[PDB]
Design a protein around this ligand. Structure first.
Ligand SMILES: O=c1ccn(-c2cccc(OC(F)(F)F)c2)nc1-c1ccnn1-c1ccccc1
Ligand SMILES: [Mg+2]
Ligand SMILES: [Zn+2]
Length: 313
């Protein structure tokens, strides 16, 4: 109860900012997370011994892939933390609890492959879940770890609250399926502009949490340029590995994933910023004005990629 986590002055200050980078020291990430959970929810909301055990089990169940790894997990959790801290009064006690957990677990057991690769490979998980295949697997993994002994960090919740919070987590994790983003943002836009968006409508909160999850998930595009630029190497390293596996199944992969088409990455990023990222953070800013820094930072990077194409780097 009286064991407050603290951080070095630079991290103490720089962690409250959206563009924070959690650094190269793996061993500090658990403490960074607990710090955020405390500041974002309360010193009280989780039992420290249970939390740490949960944190470490979740870490053990991320894999050593170039991008969809433990560092991504914590990065995504941090973006959410920022959003929650800049929208203090908008969210319930359970929402602040479940969402940070949802983000930590959102890519549990990821192997670096898209849902499509599993379909075409005919992976057994694809049999079990036709849509949002990895995301239903990520949620399922979260439930496993939650049921290990000494791991129920929600043990003080009533039966009801427990079910609510696990439903927050489930919907939140499903929403990281980007195929579902496009519709979700379309609807939030029309609801916002036609004035009908309404945060007492649970059906509407669900959608809004979905968009926050897309925002947090994509948040490497909202970092300072050198962090964004370097993360890109990792994202594309998984892509090209998948392309390879596609070619192995006798299927020319889309150029995004073809490592013989490395030269098209800059134009590919442009496309993605215009087609995906900029819309995401625009709409999110409209719904949640204080998240504007994500939009700004995203635009800055879009400009930086334009500069790559023009040979200015
Ligand atoms: O830099 C990028 C370039 C292309 N894509 C991407 C991913 C999936 C489908 C897609 O094309 C679509 F289907 F949308 F048209 C494009 N994502 C990123 C990116 C940036 C940050 N995260 N992130 C990412 C990575 C992997 C998975 C989900 C997001
Ligand atoms: Mg994912
Ligand atoms: Zn992710």
């Amino acid at each position: 109860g009286l064991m407050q986590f603290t951080l070095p002055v630079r991290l103490c200050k720089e962690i409250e900012l959206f563009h924070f980078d959690i650094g190269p020291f793996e061993n500090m990430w658990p403490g960074i997370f607990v710090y955020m959970v405390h500041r974002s929810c309360g010193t009280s909301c989780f039992e420290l011994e249970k939390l740490c055990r949960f944190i470490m089990s979740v870490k053990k169940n991320y894999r050593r892939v170039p991008y969809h790894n433990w560092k991504h997990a914590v990065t995504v959790a941090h973006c959410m933390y920022a959003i929650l801290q800049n929208n203090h009064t908008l969210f319930t006690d359970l929402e602040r609890k479940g969402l940070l957990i949802a983000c930590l677990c959102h890519d549990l057991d990821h192997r670096g492959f898209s849902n499509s690769y599993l379909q075409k490979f005919d992976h057994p998980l694809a049999a079990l879940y036709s849509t949002s295949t990895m995301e239903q697997h990520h949620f399922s993994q979260t439930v496993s770890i939650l049921q290990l002994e000494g791991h129920n960090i929600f043990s003080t919740l009533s039966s009801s609250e427990y079910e609510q919070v696990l439903e927050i987590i489930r919907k939140a994790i499903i929403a990281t399926d980007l195929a579902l983003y496009f519709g979700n943002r379309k609807q939030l836009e029309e609801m916002y502009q036609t004035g009908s968006l309404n945060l007492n409508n649970q059906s509407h909160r669900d959608r809004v949490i979905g968009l926050m999850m897309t925002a947090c998930d994509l948040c490497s595009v909202t970092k300072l340029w050198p962090v964004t630029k370097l993360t890109a190497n990792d994202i594309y390293a998984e892509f090209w590995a998948e392309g390879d596996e596609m070619k192995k199944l006798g299927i020319q992969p889309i150029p995004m994933m073809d490592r013989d088409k490395k030269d098209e990455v800059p134009q590919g990023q442009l496309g993605f910023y215009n087609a995906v990222a900029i819309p995401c953070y625009t709409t999110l800013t409209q719904i949640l004005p204080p998240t504007e820094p994500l939009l700004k930072a995203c635009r800055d990077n879009l400009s930086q990629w334009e500069k790559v194409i023009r040979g200015e780097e």
